[PDB]
């Protein structure tokens, strides 16, 4: 139920920290901070070193044709799943779903974001974006740990069978406990990777989850 | 900003050899190339530094930045360090996310382009209804470079009205998506073209033909003269 957001930007530190918390997590979310600094080959390296599943948090948000290319390149690099924005509309999400279905991979639809700015435009479109996901056959979603009430509303729309993961825990102030009342797993980055003892930080979170 | 021939190449080929060959075939016609994730994820960010060493062209990184503030800052820093002159950012995630990009660009002496409304059909679902507010947010934040759709010139004129003539506006959707350069360049300062050039049997010939079509529009090269021309185009559009 704990996914590591590995946003360190150099290979040595990213590999070291992930290795230190490997016993506590089996899925690592890798985004552009690490990929743009070290290359897409870092995904294969993580899989070789840790045997973990990799979610590419690329916030895909282009036209359909470009989205297809991004998804193909990301799955060829070995990612198990990719995070896609829904605000650009249904055709753009469908382009990602088509490639994921062809390659046996997964699309996670980001319905509402966790930061303050999310309230400006995303929040008002969130329920509609989630219903669009349901209509498109999306089974994996991302929602905000910082707004438990919004997270419960999202869970209502997507149903109990869909998988929901949630960022914003720790640094952004979301609570592991309340978040896991609705989400299947929480994403944690800085609270673990900025710590002098990341293993102890991750163990602490796991403790809270067990409890 | 002023781009040679008002034409920006969208280089979305996915392998280095072809990307460098096609850009080399058309470089005499442009001074600005837009590089996005199809090429960067396939060949690495080092491809930007390679283009900067190989050609005397400005590089706009079309990364559609759309994350939380802290992650946006990291993305922008890595992108500018790699050599990009500018980066394209989404406004839908909010003002704090755009401000994070502007702060890094200011610190590093680079530029941010704010994407206000997209060119594809799906843009009508959520983005179009937020676009004017996103453009006003850009004005409030001091953004001076914008991206708007060639596929909806009426929407592009409204965007120009909001951002004013002292902001730079570029527009994709010409060629493959059917946008009209003429109506588009009544409002935008430059058009972005990808597939119509890079999938052509002769990219140089395709680029040269588009440039002839742009010259047929008789758009002044002189900044003040095109500012007056654009003011009249907008006044006519709103009259
Ligand atoms: O709504 C969202 C979507 N994605 N992320 C991402 O999830 C991670 C959360 O990291 P943190 O624990 O360090 O805040 C980062 O990679 C960030 O880009 C959010 O924080 N909020
Ligand atoms: O609203 C937008 C924003 N960006 N792009 C991008 O501009 C280019 C247009 O390419 P094309 O001429 O091949 O359609 C591609 O890189 C695409 O991702 C659009 O097409 N529409």
UniProtKB/Swiss-Prot annotation, chain B:
The keyword Iron-sulfur does not apply. Substrate binds at residues 12, 34, 62-71, 119, 172-182, 194-195. It comes from the Archaea. One of its GO terms (biological process) is 'de novo' UMP biosynthetic process. PROSITE patterns: OMPDECASE. Disulfide bonds: none annotated. The keyword Lyase applies. It catalyses: orotidine 5'-phosphate + H(+) = UMP + CO2. Its EC number is 4.1.1.23. SUPFAM superfamilies: Ribulose-phoshate binding barrel. Keywords: Decarboxylase, Lyase, Pyrimidine biosynthesis. GO terms for cellular component: cytosol. Pathway: Pyrimidine metabolism; UMP biosynthesis via de novo pathway; UMP from orotate: step 2/2. GO terms for molecular function: orotidine-5'-phosphate decarboxylase activity. Pfam families: OMPdecase. The active site is at residue 64. Gene3D superfamilies: Aldolase class I. CDD domains: OMP_decarboxylase_like (cd04725). Belongs to the OMP decarboxylase family. Type 1 subfamily. Homodimer. Catalyzes the decarboxylation of orotidine 5'-monophosphate (OMP) to uridine 5'-monophosphate (UMP). This is Orotidine 5'-phosphate decarboxylase.
């Amino acid at each position: 139920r704990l996914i590591l957001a590995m946003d360190l930007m150099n290979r040595d530190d990213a590999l070291r920290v992930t290795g230190e918390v490997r016993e506590y997590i089996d899925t690592v979310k890798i985004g552009y901070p690490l990929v743009l600094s070290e290359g897409m080959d870092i995904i294969a390296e993580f899989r070789k070193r840790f045997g973990c599943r990799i979610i590419a948090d690329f916030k895909v948000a282009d036209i359909p044709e470009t989205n297809e290319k991004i998804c193909r390149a990301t799955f060829k690099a070995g990612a198990d799943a990719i995070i896609v924005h829904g605000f650009p509309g249904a055709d753009s999400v469908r382009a990602c779903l088509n490639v994921a279905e062809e390659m046996g991979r997964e699309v996670f639809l980001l319905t509402e974001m966790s930061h303050p700015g999310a309230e400006m435009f995303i929040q008002g479109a969130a329920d509609e974006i989630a219903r669009m996901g349901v209509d498109l056959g999306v089974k994996n979603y991302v929602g905000p740990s910082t707004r438990p009430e919004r997270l419960s509303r999202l869970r209502e729309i997507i149903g109990q069978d869909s998988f929901l993961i949630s960022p914003g825990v720790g640094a952004q102030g979301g609570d592991p406990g309340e978040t896991l009342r609705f989400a299947d797993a929480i994403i944690v980055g800085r609270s673990i990777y900025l710590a002098d003892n990341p293993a102890a930080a991750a163990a602490g979170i796991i403790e809270s989850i067990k409890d």
